[PDB]
């Protein structure tokens, strides 16, 4: 079993089981992780087999992630608790108050993460920290709430729940996707002060409380930089690293030539580039790829490794407390 | 004032007032209409001035459109009634019944269209006819409902409201965007279902709206491999064989946003697939490239298809109607659904 450092590329796979070609691709030193999608899911036992064979290829084991946010963003349905959209939690906040909403968010996080942890998944790319300005359809009900305080608090409560389930968090989409219209490269014309007073606050607060990663917005904020955030040294190095003090992973979000697109991502401050639905572009990228110097990469990947062992998860899922959490969360979704 | 037929390209503009270069671009015979966005809106009076100067360039007057669906898709906010998301109408359906929901949809349509008609707008790109399968975040609350019957009936009721406000309808996104997952922004999703599955559900609102006089359709940027390997907006099977021949739709088929392989070639394959009018947004450079030496494809139905979309209310008539108590009550009712 070859020992190769996790590379800075997160790739993906076609279907339910690895092909031989995929195995060879995943052994490339450029690759450090995998993101899964609904097309990779048949049932829980198949998923376990898939994650095991991915993990068996090399050490440190490839980090495996998925988009389980809730509502209309939940890749794996059958055999999982159906998760509510995050704005459901914000509706509880408005109706029953912060305390009930936080409690509910904790349980959603716990169920979400634990069920995925049982299947060999390391991380869900959640939570969305974008504010619901009522402008952006592609975010839509994926946002907790309009109000930064509600978003921050619900996100923190979800994060604690995720940690109980073995998982770190990934805040999306830095520095805030909520204000633009999105239904192209959108433009958010606001000033940095306007963003600091609202959209950025949940990111600051989550970073302070141990958030593992961030996904950047594919959005230009011209008053701060002419470049989209995911390609901006100002956003990623000057604001996120230096000003906010964030030490976790900065993902590039989807780059899908590719070599040049990746280069500018890394140069801007991204640790890991995502290349989804395009194994051809992954093949093009990795051929003659030089791994950029990043002494923090290894630790940044490792912080995201799932913190629960397989047996410990099986035990927790047998408890009455967890099963009650499952039924509570199921009830929010219907 | 030059008399030029409306061309098959729908373009756009940069900001609040036309520049001289934009005026010259909009006189090109390749162009037949304009789509507006939030960046073109400062306030109602500026908007009126903008639409007037667009219309003054040529005859037949360039058709002007905008995306006013409701909820998180409403370009012009200040000075307009805030519109509810379409799923709010589906919630009324579930709670208070079809009759109350249809009535509400009629008022939303009326307010939506009338306020835009006051400003010189011809058409809103609405309604969404996609079904809420609980899969597609980008559609999300933009869909009326999960159930094809509810979607069809709410859409028809909205359509009658729109017509009261001077406007035709544009169904989105043919043949149905509801089932794919969509929470990236720039991927090409795949809907693996069979044609029969779509006919039993997602296609039915499109059939019904077509029969009842829907003026246009926007295609889904989605591949349905069991029917064709091409995305719907570039598929002869979807657009000619299914939409034209089988469904009998006679209105406008708009293209995807074509924004390389080159714009000329991308437009060519759109027209060849069955699109009447190509959209080229946020890229006046590509519109300039496209129109230079452009040969207008032969389409004897184009002129009538554009004209069917012209606003049916005169500007003064709309200002009068908006002073009425009945319309102001509609405004307050719709405002209340949004809050
Ligand atoms: O929102 C979506 N598509 C939008 C349309 O709704 C809109 O009328 C048109 C014009 O601006 O451009 C597309 O990008 C989709 F649901 F297809 F992703
Ligand atoms: O949804 C958006 N971006 C998504 C991320 O949320 C997601 O975690 C990632 C991995 O699948 O892929 C992006 O496209 C955006 F809002 F940025 F458009």
From Swiss-Prot, chain A:
It is found in: Cytoplasm. Coiled coil: none annotated. Its EC number is 3.2.1.52. PROSITE patterns: GLYCOSYL_HYDROL_F3. The keyword Phosphoprotein does not apply. The active site is at residue 253. The record marks 183 as: Important for catalytic activity. One of its GO terms (biological process) is regulation of cell shape. It holds the Pfam family Glyco_hydro_3. One of its GO terms (molecular function) is beta-N-acetylhexosaminidase activity. Keywords: Cell cycle, Cell division, Cell shape, Cell wall biogenesis/degradation, Cytoplasm, Glycosidase, Hydrolase, Peptidoglycan synthesis. It is an enzyme of class 3 (hydrolase). It catalyses: Hydrolysis of terminal non-reducing N-acetyl-D-hexosamine residues in N-acetyl-beta-D-hexosaminides. Substrate binds at residues 67, 75, 142, 172-173. Pathway: Cell wall biogenesis; peptidoglycan recycling. One of its GO terms (cellular component) is cytoplasm. The keyword Cytoplasm applies. InterPro entries: Beta_hexosaminidase_bac, Glyco_hydro_3_AS, Glyco_hydro_3_N, Glyco_hydro_3_N_sf, Glycoside_hydrolase_SF, NagZ_Beta-hexosaminidase. Plays a role in peptidoglycan recycling by cleaving the terminal beta-1,4-linked N-acetylglucosamine (GlcNAc) from peptide-linked peptidoglycan fragments, giving rise to free GlcNAc, anhydro-N-acetylmuramic acid and anhydro-N-acetylmuramic acid-linked peptides. Belongs to the glycosyl hydrolase 3 family. NagZ subfamily. This is Beta-hexosaminidase. It comes from Neisseria gonorrhoeae (strain ATCC 700825 / FA 1090). The gene is nagZ.
